[PDB]
Paper text:
The α-keto acid dehydrogenase complex family catalyzes the essential oxidative decarboxylation of α-keto acids to yield acyl-CoA and NADH. PDC, OGDC, and BCKDC are each comprised of multiple copies of a substrate-specific dihydrolipoamide acetyltransferase (E2p), dihydrolipoamide succinyltransferase (E2o), or dihydrolipoamide acyltransferase (E2b) inner catalytic (IC) core surrounded by multiple copies of the respective α-keto acid dehydrogenase (E1p, E1o, or E1b) and universal dihydrolipoamide dehydrogenase (E3) components. Here, we report the cryo-electron microscopy structures of the endogenous cubic 2-oxoglutarate dehydrogenase complex (OGDC) and icosahedral pyruvate dehydrogenase complex (PDC) cores from bovine kidney determined at resolutions of 3.5 Å and 3.8 Å, respectively. In addition, despite sharing a similar monomeric fold, OGDC and PDC E2 cores have distinct interdomain and intertrimer interactions, which suggests a means of modulating self-assembly to mitigate heterologous binding between mismatched E2 species.
The pyruvate dehydrogenase complex (PDC; components suffixed by ‘p’) is an essential element of life that catalyzes the oxidative decarboxylation of pyruvate to acetyl-coenzyme A (acetyl-CoA). We initially identified PDC based on its distinct icosahedral architecture. This is confirmed by atomic model building of the bovine E2p sequence into the icosahedral cryo-EM density map, which showed good agreement between the sequence and the respective side chain densities. For E2p, the backbones of residues 420–647 are fully traceable, except for residues 519 and 520, which lack densities. Due to missing density at the βE–βF β-turn, two residues (Ala519 and Gly520) are unmodelled in our E2p model. Adjacent to the region of missing density, a putative density for the lipoyl moiety was identified near the catalytic residues Ser566 and His620′ and the gatekeeper residue Leu521. In E2p, H2 instead has a length of 14 residues (Gly455–Leu468) and is a single, uninterrupted helix. H7 of E2p (Pro642–Leu646) has a length of five residues and one additional residue (Leu647) at the C-terminus. The E2p knob has one hydrophobic surface that binds a single hydrophobic pocket in the socket. Heterogeneity of E3BP distribution precludes identification and experimental structural determination of E3BP from native mammalian PDC.
Residue numbers in the entry:
A (entry chain 2c): 433 to 518, 521 to 647
B (entry chain 2e), C (entry chain 2g), D (entry chain 2f): 420 to 518, 521 to 647
Amino acid sequence: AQRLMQSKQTIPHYYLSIDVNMGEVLLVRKELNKMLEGKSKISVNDFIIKASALACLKVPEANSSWMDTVIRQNHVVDISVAVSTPLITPIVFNAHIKGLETIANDVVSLATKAREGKLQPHEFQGGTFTISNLGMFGIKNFSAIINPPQACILAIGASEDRLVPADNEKGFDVASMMSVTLSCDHRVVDGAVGAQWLAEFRKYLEKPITMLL
Amino acid sequence: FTDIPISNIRRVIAQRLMQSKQTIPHYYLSIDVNMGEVLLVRKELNKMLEGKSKISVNDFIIKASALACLKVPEANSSWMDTVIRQNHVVDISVAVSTPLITPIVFNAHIKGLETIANDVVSLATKAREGKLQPHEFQGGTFTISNLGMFGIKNFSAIINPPQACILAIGASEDRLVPADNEKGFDVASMMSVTLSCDHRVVDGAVGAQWLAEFRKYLEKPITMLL
Amino acid sequence: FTDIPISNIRRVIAQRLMQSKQTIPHYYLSIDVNMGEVLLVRKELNKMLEGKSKISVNDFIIKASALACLKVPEANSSWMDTVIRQNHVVDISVAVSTPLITPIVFNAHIKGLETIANDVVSLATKAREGKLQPHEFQGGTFTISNLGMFGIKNFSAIINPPQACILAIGASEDRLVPADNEKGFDVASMMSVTLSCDHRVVDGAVGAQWLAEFRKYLEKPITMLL
Amino acid sequence: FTDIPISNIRRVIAQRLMQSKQTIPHYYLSIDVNMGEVLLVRKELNKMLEGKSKISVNDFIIKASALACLKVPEANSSWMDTVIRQNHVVDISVAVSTPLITPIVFNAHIKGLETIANDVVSLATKAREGKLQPHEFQGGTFTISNLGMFGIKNFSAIINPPQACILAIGASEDRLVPADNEKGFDVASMMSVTLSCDHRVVDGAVGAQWLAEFRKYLEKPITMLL
């Protein structure tokens, strides 16, 4: 509670939100999972980890961390993933380097240890970024609370089918949307640079082929 | 008739070629890789780049081979007396014709596909039109040589003294492939890939695994996300 | 990075293999053999056996190569200083992957096709999960190594020190072959066979005869009755 | 079993063959050449010859290789210590099976196509049933070895000590080639060509140029007029 309250009253929060098309992602997931052949399961959340991680490299300002009299900058992106615990934030190191499937193995092992065991204190403290997912409970959109040292945090809603105008004789088709909400420390993340990171994240996720960079 | 004195630059090269070839026993492997999927991917990437930079088919080979080395670390290792030296990082060296030099691309298993294309262009331009610092082209952990630009179907190369593997790349062809169509066939593009291995380190079975793994990565570029 | 000390087993193989390649000159050959007739015969033999044992496609290669050695005894010989040694019996050594060992099948030119299948299975089981007597895998008069199980199209292999020839077998494939049909073609399975010969003993002409003779035996299994 | 003493004729061949492989590094190249046009030209000339002389498909290779050497003089050179010897003439040596000798055809880049056919026939007749002067068959500036008459698809050959290149020729096949017809293909003959080069003198780039230049001459016998 102390950290949560302090973070809110010391860090001025301002939020952004967009809608990301997930039609292309599901097609890729069917192939990869098929390629895995049961070796590993790649969740839709796993694509979010790498897509956000690479977006941090292209926009390093969002990955930074505010300190008094000096703005600390991080060239590595250790992304922390929030998981419900009867709430803990395990850390995935070098999210901008390691492969897509190894992230899935890492998150599964950490989640199992988190829910049914003890984590070493450094393994869930001092992350350079945070991602929290609530789509499993049907939440359309929400805003989160940032960690004290960090500068941004992602919020992910549930995916749903929405009509999209099309050139079809019928004039439309069905595409699965989802809403992404980002909370930024306005001292470090300006409106323009924050918009660039969220727009850059959309382009990576809207076409998984571009994730090869 | 005419006699031409040897240059000192070529002298060392000759020494290395002969020595590396003779000291190391070389056994060669070869396969054929389908290029239908890569060309489709290259069209999408180059279109989305909107002229910022161009990704060559050779750029896909660099990353695909680099990830294959991680999955089969034996091919990425090096041989020394009384110790087999294992390399955890992959520094792929790309051969380019020079009136022959081997610029080194560091961390090919980590850096993105597009940055590889920028790196190879800058190094190649510097190699042809200028001077390279000696470390920049000495001590690679792997080597790739491309001759498909001259119409060579297939060939075999000569390894560097410290390395353990080297790829040989032929030209992209157009060959009939049996299919389930009413015509029973369709046109598909194939490239032959030849690998030369030091049999002291790389056995037949492990060498086959690396080459087969390389085929799977290149035959479906989506899997390069791993 | 990581350095691995070399085991004596690797050390014995390394110096044995390196000496063979740096001493024996190697010239190679390659042909394509049709598998249309072989597969049909395998279906009949395996069916009639009613599950007693399974005859592998590799087993047909053993006898077909063995009978080819009888018709071309020059390839079956062995090089010694000041005297070329000729072998009348044909002991064929088959290479099997081992985390690489070469069990020896004796009198391959005499024993029947099915007994070869039983022999190769028993030896391979002992090779992977047991101890084999040295002679049982030393001093073979011929060598066959198969890598078709890993998708390798074609490759060349190193020779043993005392031997004179070695067969390299690629993976079976499906390739179009021109025909007199209204479509002008039909689908027929092919495979590439690569032979490495010591040019001191095996000349180009005699080497071609052995490989061509091997094709005729394997292209029509009825002819293996001799 | 049987032991055979080594003859001195095979003995003198041995060291020359022994020294060549362990002293000259070896790298090989390979392509596929369409032989469709040549056959059409051969029918006309043989007709024109009216039985006066016969022109084999091998005869076209002699002149095509000879003219290729003029356009790429590096492949025609010879490696000496501390000096790269250069040849402005192309004395092509043709290999013929002998119960293996290399008759030399002098000035192959100058003399006419039919005169080569008469020369190769007379020399082969003198070689097999007669005696030849050592020079007549020693000191060639280039070598061509043919094994397509036995059905070999492709092979690689050992290089002579003083030379820098050697050609290997496979058998003429029949392969499907994609076309613009309503059937989408047509039958066209092919011929695999393998070139073996000393890597000290012949780099990959210059070697590819010679093989490609040889390819262009052979696809269209009109171009041999230079």
